[PDB]
Structure 1
Amino acid sequence: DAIAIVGMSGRYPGARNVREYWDNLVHARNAIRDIPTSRWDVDKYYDPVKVYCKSMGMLDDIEHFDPLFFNIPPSEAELMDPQHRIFLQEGYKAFEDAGYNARTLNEKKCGVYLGIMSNEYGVMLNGNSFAIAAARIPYFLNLKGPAIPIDTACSSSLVGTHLARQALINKEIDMALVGGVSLYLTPESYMSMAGMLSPDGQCKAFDNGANGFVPGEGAGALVLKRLKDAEADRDHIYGIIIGSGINQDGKTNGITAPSAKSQMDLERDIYETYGIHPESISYVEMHGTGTKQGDPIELEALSTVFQEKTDKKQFCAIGSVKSNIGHTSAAAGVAGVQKVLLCMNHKTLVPTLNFTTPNEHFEFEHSPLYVNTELKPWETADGKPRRACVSSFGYSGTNAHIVIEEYQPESALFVLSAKKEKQLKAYAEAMKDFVTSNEDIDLEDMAYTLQTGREAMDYRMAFLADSREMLIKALDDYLAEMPNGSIFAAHVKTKKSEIKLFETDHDAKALLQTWIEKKRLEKVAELWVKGLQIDWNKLYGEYTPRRISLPAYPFAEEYYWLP
């Protein structure tokens, strides 16, 4: 039936994570920049009539990787496509976002479906097959569901989402990591213009001045489960997928041209199959690439399908994040889904950019659709959950469309750890920023998540806090190395002797168990940082807190490029 999205991680132009992404969207920020010479020299390729676009939605630090975290030799890192490296990181972080760790994922029937469409690094070098790109994560975490790369060009990550959904419903897997990754590493590839690119370097979605897309980079992952399992497992749930479908354009006027009829059929069939009335939908994240013939075809298709069922006018907002971050290709779908989920969570619609005058080839006034250019509350009538769609179409003609529905749910001991001390310090900084930014965080949920939803690694710190202010001060104290009697920190390999007593002796265990049961948190904390395994469940009686989204591991930022 319904598929729950229980974890996400995103890395897009101008946004190192989904929290920065959200902030940028709310503030209607455009992340497209001129291509710097550190990538390539546009002047050596630029011709205005060769490349005729000098702009890109770019990721920062595409060379950074933490190979030691993944048990990969540093020298092997140089030989890895950064698309592989970046997804390995984001994919991992999605799991941690959900509150799952290596221990809890071991032997899980989790499928991995990875959108990917380019091979630039591999060619530059003359391990880097699509097949291996997908298999990296399963190999690392010991997952047992199929690992499949999907190259349907720009629809890739949405197509993957469909396949994962069907495998989950058919009970072939019990979890799914779906995502996409796209980088533009060479003048040659980003180049193919074929007439595709805008000379102004913007995706002018829905606008009469639409004249092509600007290439964007991105890497995004989702964690999917059956809704029934997600509720039983007490996951935190971003939203639910209540319908999806994929099809083909077939014979068009040129293989990269779109088909109105196919787009209508896709959308109509989905709504009919899953009993979804177009009136129930209030936002659509369009493919919306800002191409002159593509935009009006998409608009006309969707409008027509909606109008078949309803006379209501201008009830459904449309937008495209490609207006913000460019066309992130294989990662386009996951970028779009993540926008909609964030919109749902905050009950807020955000502006679509670069829209001045409606495309002449489509009339909005008598349409169910309207272009939203406002930061405004996402209103819903009665009790009803918000519903949205995401479309993604590829140049090869393979189309995807999913329907997402809002999910409507019915002193603490803080522990942190990392594989190196430097990353532990980075972790504490990320948590401090997060708590600073999120004034309403549930302290018990957060602590519970750090306890049960993160792997205890070798470098540890812990502390007590009963308030946001106390929490922030503890982290500040830790970071500033200024003495605080409630802060504990150790390297586990150093302390083995100081812990053995509680591991072997019968009365010491019984003491430790009593400590945990009577909530003697200082004592539990001191021992935990030293490496003692704590049964966290014992900390909780009638009331158990819930896992929530927190910042994920802050990987070492080590530079690896061509050998």
Structure 2
Amino acid sequence: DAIAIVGMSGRYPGARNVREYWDNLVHARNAIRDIPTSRWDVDKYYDPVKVYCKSMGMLDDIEHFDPLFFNIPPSEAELMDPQHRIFLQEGYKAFEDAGYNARTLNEKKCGVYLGIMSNEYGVMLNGNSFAIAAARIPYFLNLKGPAIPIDTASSSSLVGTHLARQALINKEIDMALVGGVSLYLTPESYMSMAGMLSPDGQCKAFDNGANGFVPGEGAGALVLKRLKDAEADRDHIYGIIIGSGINQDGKTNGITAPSAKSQMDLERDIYETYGIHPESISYVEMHGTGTKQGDPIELEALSTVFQEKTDKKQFCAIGSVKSNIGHTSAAAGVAGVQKVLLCMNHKTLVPTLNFTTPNEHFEFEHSPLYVNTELKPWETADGKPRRACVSSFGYSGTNAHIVIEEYQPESALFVLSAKKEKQLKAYAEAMKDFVTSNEDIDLEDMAYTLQTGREAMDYRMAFLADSREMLIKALDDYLAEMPNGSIFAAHVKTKKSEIKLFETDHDAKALLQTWIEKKRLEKVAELWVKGLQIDWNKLYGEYTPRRISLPAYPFAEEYYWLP
């Protein structure tokens, strides 16, 4: 039936994580910049009549990777497509977002469905196949569901979502990691203009000035489970997928042109199959690429389908994050899904950009649809969960559309760890920022997530806190190296002898067990940082807190490029 989204991670232009993404959306920020000479010299390719677009939504630090984290030799990292490297990182972080770690993922039947559509690095070099890109995560984490790359161009990551959903519903897998990654490394690729790109370097989605898209870069991942499992497992749930479908354009006027009729059939068939009335939908993240003949076709299709079922007018807001970040290609679907989930979580709609005058080939006034350009509350009537759709159409003519529904659910000991001390310090910084930004964080849920939803790695710190202010101060003291008697820290490999007593003696174990049961947190903390395995479940009696989303591992930022 319903598929829960239980974890997410993303990296988009202007946004290193989904928190910065949300902040950028709320503030109507546009991330598109001129391409710098550190990528390639646009002057050497630019002609106005060659490339006619000089702009891109670009990711920062595409060369950065933490190969040692993944048991990969540094020299092999230079030979790996950065698409692979960046997805490996984001995919891993999505699992940590959900509160799953290597131990809890080991041997899981988790499918991996990866949207990917380009091979620039591998060519520049003359390991880098799409097959291997999709398999890196399963190899690392010892997953056992199928690992399949999907290249249906810009619908890839939504196609992958559809396949994962079907596999989950058929019980062939028990979890999925779905995602997409796109980079534009070369003037040659990004180039293919084919007439596709905007000379102004903006996706003017829905606007009469729409004249092509601006390429964008990105990487994102979602972790999916059947809703009944997610509820039994006490996952945190961002939203639910309640319908999806894929089809083809078939014969169009040129193989890259869209089909109104296919888009209508796709949407109608989904809504009929899954019993979804268009009146119940209040937002659609459109494919919305800002192409002159594409945009009106999309609007007219969707509008027509909605109007078959209702006479209600201007009840469904439409937008496209491509107006913020550009066209992120194989990652486009996952970027749109994330935007929708964030909007649902905060009960807020955010502006779509670059919209001055409606496209002349479509009349909005008598449409179910309207273009939302305002930051505003996402209102819903009565009890009802919010619902939204996401569309993603590819140049090869394979289309996808999904429907998402809002999910409506019925002293603490803080521990942190990393593979290197420098990354522990970066972790503490990330947590301090997060807590600073999130004044309402539930401290007991946060601690419980750090205890049970993160792997205990070799460099450790821990401390007690009963409030946000105390928590912030401990992290500050840790970072400033300023003495604080409630902060503990150690490198596990250095403390083996100091812990052995509690691992082998029967009365020591019984005293440790008693300590954990009577919540003697200072004692548990000192021993944990030294490497002692703590049975965290024993800390909790009648009441067990819940896993929540927290910042995920701060990878080492080591540069690797062509050998």
Unaligned regions of 5+ residues in structure 1, if any?
none
Deviations 1:396-418 (A, max 9, x none): 00000000000000000000000
Give the Cα separation in 1 of the matches to 2:532 and 2:550: 24
Structure 1 Cα separation of the partners of residues 82 and 414 of structure 2: 34
Q: Secondary structure at the match of 1:7?
A: strand
Q: The residue matched to 1:68 in structure 2 has which SS?
A: helix
- Deviation readout 1:181-205 (Å, 9 max, x if unpaired): 0000000000000000000000000
Q: Which residue of 2 aligns with 1:111?
A: 111
Q: CA deviation at 1:539?
A: 0.1
Deviation digits for residues 90-119 of structure 1 (CA, Å, limit 9, x no counterpart): 000000000000000000000000000000
Aligned to 2:414: 414
2:376 is aligned with 1:376: yes
Q: Deviations over 1:424-473 (max 9, x none)?
A: 00000000000000000000000000000000000000000000000000
Q: 2: distance between equivalents of 1:120 and 1:417?
A: 36
Q: What's the offset of the Cα at 1:53?
A: 0.0
State how far apart, in whole Å, the 2-side matches of 1:317 and 1:105 are.
39
Partners of 1:467 and 1:224 lie apart in 2 by 33
Corresponding residue SS for 1:219? strand
CA distance in 1: counterparts of 2:86 and 2:411, whole angstroms:
38
Report the identity percentage: 100
In the TM superposition, residue 215 of structure 1 has moved relative to its aligned partner by 0.0
Gaps in structure 2 of 5+ consecutive residues:
none
CA distance in 1 between partners of 2:130 and 2:380 (Å)? 42
Partners in 1 of 2:475 and 2:226 — Cα distance?
37
Deviation track 1:319-372 (CA, whole Å, cap 9, x = no partner) reads 000000000000000000000000000000000000000000000000000000
**Residue 301 of structure 1: how far off its partner (Å):** 0.0
Deviation for aligned residue 1:531: 0.1
Q: How big is the shift at 1:559?
A: 0.1
Runs of at least 4 residues off by over 6 Å: none
- SS in structure 2 opposite 1:290? coil
Query: Cα deviation per residue 1:289-338 (whole Å; 9 max; x = unaligned)?
Result: 00000000000000000000000000000000000000000000000000
CA distance in 2, matches of 1:224, 1:244: 14
Aligned-pair distance for 1:218? 0.2
Post-superposition offset of 1:84: 0.0
What is the alpha-carbon distance in structure 2 between the residues aligned to residue 552 and residue 264 of structure 1?
40
**Aligned equivalent of 1:236:** 236
Distance 1:550 1:356 in 2: 38
Determine helix, strand or coil for the equivalent of 1:69.
Answer: helix
| CA distance, structure 2, for counterparts of residue 150 and residue 463 of structure 1 | 44
The normalised TM-score by structure 1 is: 1.00
Report the Cα distance in structure 2 between the residues aligned to 1:446 and 1:245, rounded to whole angstroms.
37
Deviation at 1:510, TM superposition (A): 0.0
Give the Cα separation in 2 of the matches to 1:383 and 1:409.
Answer: 13
Distance (Å, rounded) in 2 between the aligned partners of 1:88 and 1:483: 38
How far residue 172 of structure 1 moved from its aligned partner, in angstroms, is 0.0
How far has the Cα of 1:524 moved from its partner? 0.0
Q: Deviations over 1:212-236 (max 9, x none)?
A: 0000000000000000000000000
SS in 1 for 2:69: coil
Q: The residue matched to 1:6 in structure 2 has which SS?
A: strand
How far, CA to CA, are the matches of 2:384 and 2:516 in structure 1?
A: 43
1:376 to partner: Cα distance: 0.1
Task: Please report how far the alpha carbon of residue 170 of structure 1 lies from its aligned counterpart in structure 2 after TM superposition.
Answer: 0.0
Residue of structure 2 in register with 1:78 after alignment: 78
1:45 corresponds to 2:16: no
User: Deviation at 1:78?
Assistant: 0.1
CA distance in 2, matches of 1:151, 1:109: 23
| TM superposition shift of 1:383 | 0.1
Q: CA deviation at 1:287?
A: 0.1
Q: 2-side partners of 1:320 and 1:502: how far apart? A: 57
Deviation at 1:540, TM superposition (A): 0.1
Deviations 1:473-518 (CA, angstroms, capped at 9, x unpaired): 0000000000000000000000000000000000000000000000
**Aligned partners of 1:230 and 1:155: how far apart in 2?**
27
Give SS of 1:389's match: strand
The match for 2:459 is 459
The TM-score normalised by the length of structure 2 is 1.00
Note if 1:163 corresponds to 2:170: no
Alpha-carbon shift at residue 557 of structure 1 (Å): 0.1
Distance 1:456 1:238 in 2: 26
Q: 2-side partners of 1:209 and 1:467: how far apart?
A: 52
Structure 2 partner of 1:193: 193
Q: SS at 1:240's partner residue?
A: strand
Shift of 1:67: 0.0
Structure 2: distance between partners of 1:68 and 1:350: 39
CA distance in 1: counterparts of 2:536 and 2:393, whole angstroms: 46
C-alpha distance in 2 between matches for 1:302 and 1:490: 58
CA deviation map 1:153-203 (0-9, x unaligned): 000000000000000000000000000000000000000000000000000
Deviation at 1:152, TM superposition (A): 0.1
Who is 2:395 aligned against? 395
SS at match of 1:148: strand
The Cα of 1:420 is off from its aligned counterpart by: 0.1
For residue 317 of structure 1, give the secondary structure of its aligned residue in structure 2. strand
RMSD of the alignment, in Å? 0.1
CA distance in structure 2 between the partners assigned to 1:220 and 1:88 by the alignment: 10
The 3-state SS of whatever aligns with 1:225 is strand
SS in 1 for 2:68: coil
Count, aligned residues? 563
Report deviation, 1:138. 0.0
Q: Secondary structure at the match of 1:538?
A: helix
How far does residue 556 in structure 1 lie from its aligned partner after superposition?
0.1
Distance in 2 between the 1:128 and 1:85 partners?
A: 11
Distance 1:559 1:17 in 2: 19
Deviation at 1:36, TM superposition (A): 0.0
Aligned to 1:125: 125
Report the Cα distance in structure 2 between the residues aligned to 1:511 and 1:56, rounded to whole angstroms.
61
Report the 3-state secondary structure (helix = DSSP H, G, I; strand = E; otherwise coil) of the residue aligned with 2:450: helix
| Secondary structure, aligned partner of 1:460 | strand
SS in 1 for 2:70: coil
Give per-residue Cα distances to partners, 1:270-301, cap 9 Å, x unaligned. Answer: 00000000000000000000000000000000
Residue in structure 2 matched with residue 424 of structure 1 by the alignment: 424
CA distance in 2, matches of 1:338, 1:318: 15
- CA offsets 1:40-61 (integer angstroms, 9 cap, x no match): 0000000000000000000000
State the partner residue of 1:146.
146
SS in 2 for 1:181: strand
How much does 1:262 deviate? 0.1
Instruction: Report the equivalent of 2:436.
Output: 436
